[PDB]
Amino acid sequence: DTPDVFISYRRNSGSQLASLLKVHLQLHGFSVFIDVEKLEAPKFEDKLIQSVMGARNFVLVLSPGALDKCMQDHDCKDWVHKEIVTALSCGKNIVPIIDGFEWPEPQVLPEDMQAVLTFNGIKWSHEYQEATIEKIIRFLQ
Numbered sequence: 001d002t003p004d005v006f007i008s009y010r011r012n013s014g015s016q017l018a019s020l021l022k023v024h025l026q027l028h029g030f031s032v033f034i035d036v037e038k039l040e041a042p043k044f045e046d047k048l049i050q051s052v053m054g055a056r057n058f059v060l061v062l063s064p065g066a067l068d069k070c071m072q073d074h075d076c077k078d079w080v081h082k083e084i085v086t087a088l089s090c091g092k093n094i095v096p097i098i099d100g101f102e103w104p105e106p107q108v109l110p111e112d113m114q115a116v117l118t119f120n121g122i123k124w125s126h127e128y129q130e131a132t133i134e135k136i137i138r139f140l141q
């Protein structure tokens, strides 16, 4: 329950890229967890997500509009928002992956996740996936 990488992603827009990152990393011997259930169940406590805390790295798939559902989510109901907050609280090495994503202004995001904009992103390249994956692995711990 302590893999190398946790992959956070938006279901409707980043499912295939998050999956491609996962199997690429597995080809290099890394263990990876990804949430494909994403049930709309409520966690009515400010609880850190266990799977994020256990993973040694936090990879964030920034597909188009991936953080849209995080805006005004001050009650922290959104899955991706809660995952990012857990990663920030635990001091995780956060590695955002950019695939046609416009970095929004910090004011439109809840206070507890605005710190995610300060991490270095890595642009994804379909033509040079192998080269991109090696760069991602260099940013891993």
Ligand SMILES: [Cl-]
Residues within 6 Å of the ligand: 009, 010, 011, 012, 038, 079, 080
């Ligand atoms: Cl989602």
